[PDB]
Amino acid sequence: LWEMPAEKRIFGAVLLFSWTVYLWETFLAQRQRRIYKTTTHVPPELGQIMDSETFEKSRLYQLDKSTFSFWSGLYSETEGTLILLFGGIPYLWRLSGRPEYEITQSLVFLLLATLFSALAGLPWSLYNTFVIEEKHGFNQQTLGFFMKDAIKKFVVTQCILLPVSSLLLYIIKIGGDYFFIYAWLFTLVVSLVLVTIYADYIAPLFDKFTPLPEGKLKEEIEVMAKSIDFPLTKVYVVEGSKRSSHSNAYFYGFKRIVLFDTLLEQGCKNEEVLAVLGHALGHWKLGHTVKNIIISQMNSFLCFFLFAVLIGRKELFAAFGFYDSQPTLIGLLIIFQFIFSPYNEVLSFCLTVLSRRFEFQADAFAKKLGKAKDLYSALIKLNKDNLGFPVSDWLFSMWHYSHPPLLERLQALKT
């Protein structure tokens, strides 16, 4: 073309996509913000689900969350655009200087990159917990706990990041010409290792983990565990009351159950807790856990393959300001976080659609166990506990909501 450039065109394409996706999500955010402002009256369908006092408490909470979501989101989108345009990343790469040498430079660049990321986002994080979560009486955290936890998490992150990054960069630089297969198999091992280690060693460092005390709930759970042939080791009661009044539950293994102390206490009755367990046990029995891993490793193989195909192109490096050298870590950032952006956005939308279908299947499994009436009462009680707005814009919930709306889940259980 005697009218358009090459490297400057692909850089513009990245930013043009990043802004259209942002404007799409902002249009969606505006569409749902209107729902919070318009629907001031309790609907006749969700009339028995929520009362006028709880509905208005939920209306203002989701409204304050929406306002923050915009400005915190806008700052991020502006920062990203400004760092790229100003040429922050290549200049930050230069200041982290002065195969082992490139890996060391990549390691210090990463240490500096994550340090700025953590510090710039910390005031926004501090606002959410101490202004939004505190105004609507959810937060139970002190400024000291928040600060001590932020450092705790940042330290633990770097101690996992640096050795994994150094070994991954080593495999790409040393290995070849089919380096992407060993690099994909390395991430495959690192994924399964960190999954088993996390809940047993990493997770108890930030939150107090204690096994469920013996009682009517503990005995009935073992009866249910033996019934579904679930290899239960122990049930855990996570001290989530030290952070916030929010209630939830999860499960892990290679097996142990994880339930919030806010859900057990106020919370949900023992009959409702067992129904919530029956739903979570559904993801194990229906193989939702195994299916999600198969998708994640299929995605990384496709990504590493296209990376190996595009790493050789010097045009993508020159686009973002890298002319003198083509660094490996920089190649991973440009291709995985910018070139793959359209694919990553489509895949995320497809996985959100799948997550909703996986939740309906786990709810259907809870009904198949007979605890349908108990789960119906639990879902409503947990919605009041977390001040969840029952009304939602269809276009917003279809794109963002990993869990289907309360009214949709309740109607499937009633049937």
Binding site: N248, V276, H288, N386
Partner: peptide
């Protein structure tokens, strides 16, 4: 997976 989760509940909420």
């Amino acid at each position: 997976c989760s509940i909420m």
